[PDB]
Amino acid sequence: STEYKLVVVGADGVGKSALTIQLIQNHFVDEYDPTIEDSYRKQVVIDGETCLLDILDTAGQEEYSAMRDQYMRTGEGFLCVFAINNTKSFEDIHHYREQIKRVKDSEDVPMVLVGNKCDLPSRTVDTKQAQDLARSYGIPFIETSAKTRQGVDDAFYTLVREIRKHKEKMSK
Ligand SMILES: Nc1nc2c(ncn2[C@@H]2O[C@H](COP(=O)(O)OP(=O)(O)NP(=O)(O)O)[C@@H](O)[C@H]2O)c(=O)[nH]1
Ligand SMILES: NC[C@@H]1COc2cc(Cl)ccc2O1
Ligand SMILES: [Mg+2]
Ligand SMILES: [Mg+2]
């Protein structure tokens, strides 16, 4: 029983909620109901550990940056979601990461870059662009589809492995 606080961040409409609901409830939400904030728990076994995941599913846009600051201080790792057909959402990852680092006063923050909607026929953000940026940041990159469930579990479980690695580091 280790608890892990995961926050799912990203621009409007990239699939934050569809990903999270696939993880928690195992179905795909076809509808677009914009999020205020939602909280979910999931117990899972990852590499033999019993993990309690406390997941925050965030809004695409806040009216209040104090709300953004708060989740950024609370989360232990961040699922940084863009959509592969949304350039601006990819670009926004830079901004999220800079804010998170500021708010935490730290260069070392557990994160996973997620390129969602990989089921779509055309992408405007290429996998190589995204892989190269993740390499730069020293974080994993995973392509996902909440529609088909491709990559959903591996995205969240990878973020847990990154938070474990971080705690291991902050010890030594
Ligand atoms: N084809 C496809 N559509 C998807 C995928 N994920 C989400 N969608 C669709 O994209 C729309 C937005 O999804 P949603 O999960 O609500 O996005 P969000 O990032 O949570 N929006 P918000 O920022 O307002 O909370 C919905 O119509 C949803 O079904 C995906 O992987 N593939
Ligand atoms: N309701 C949002 C606040 C701030 O951020 C949170 C982050 C997590 Cl993982 C859980 C609950 C949280 O509470
Ligand atoms: Mg949402
Ligand atoms: Mg957002």
Numbering used by the authors: 1 to 172
Question: What did the study's authors say about this model?
Answer:
A truncated analogue of Abd-2, designated as Abd-3, also binds to KRASG12V-GppNHp, but with lower affinity than Abd-2, showing the intrinsic binding properties of the benzodioxane core. Protein crystallography was used to determine the KRAS-binding site for Abd-2 and for the truncated analogue Abd-3. Two different mutant KRAS-GppNHp proteins, G12D and Q61H were crystallised, and the crystals were soaked with compounds to yield high-resolution structures.
Here, we employ the intracellular antibody to identify a compound from a chemical fragment library that binds to RAS proteins adjacent to the effector binding region. Although, various RAS inhibitors have been described in literature,24–32,47,48, in this paper we describe an approach for the development of RAS-effector inhibitors by combining different elements i.e. (i) the hit identification via a method of intracellular antibody fragment competition; (ii) structure-based design via crystal structures (KRASQ61HGPPNHP) and NMR (waterLOGSY and CPMG); (iii) identification of clear structure-activity relationship (SAR) for the development of potent compounds against KRAS and (iv) the proof of concept in mechanistic and phenotypic cell assays.
